[PDB]
Amino acid sequence: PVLRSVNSREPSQVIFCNRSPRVVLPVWLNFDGEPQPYPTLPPGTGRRIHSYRGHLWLFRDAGTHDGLLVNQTELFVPSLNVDGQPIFANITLPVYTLKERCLQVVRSLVKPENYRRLDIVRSLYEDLEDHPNVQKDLERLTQERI
């Protein structure tokens, strides 16, 4: 795959800093591009972690899989540490569209089997059902890269 960690074996220490109000799930893309879940970060916390140069990470809301930003972009790639300094991965909320924010709230209150009972047009039912997904995002980022 285009999006995958490189097996560099070159250590890089990183500080994951959750500057969001969400519980953050760090996601590591393995050497075949398959995403792997790592321990979650509570809001406003920082974790010093051992990663490697050329590895790829993305960050989501742990409970809903909403996309989050890391250093203002989608993907985080550690580089070599300079003078023993760790690399910062500042995780933040994007400015979601109002429509996406509303879909997040409604999904959080209604079981998918009960989306059918909501008095909304069919297109909004389709929008609710189209949950955020790491596989879908990796496909999109793959096209954006090419």
Partner: protein, 87 residues
């Protein structure tokens, strides 16, 4: 310039024109000073206006982005309004 957005229950919301242009629908209506939303009530339209303020303030900003709050009781109607307004 300011523009007036009127709710179904007659509240008039006066907002900066550039902020109302956050909505693609409102932008098109103003292309192409007052718009009447016959199906959007004031408990929803007031929240839409807060969203415009939030979007303009925080888009391409470096300062920490806070959550945009939505009470469960308004979420369904606010979703319908956001879908119509394209914002």
């Amino acid at each position: 310039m300011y523009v007036k957005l009127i709710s179904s229950d007659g509240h008039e919301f006066i907002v900066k024109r550039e902020h109302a242009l956050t909505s693609g629908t409102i932008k098109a209506m103003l292309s192409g000073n007052e718009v009447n939303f016959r199906e959007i009530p004031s408990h929803v339209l007031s929240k839409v206006c807060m969203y415009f303020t939030y979007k303009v303030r925080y888009t391409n900003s470096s300062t920490e982005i806070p959550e945009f709050p939505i009470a469960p009781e308004i979420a369904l109607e606010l979703l319908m309004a956001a879908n119509f307004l394209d914002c």
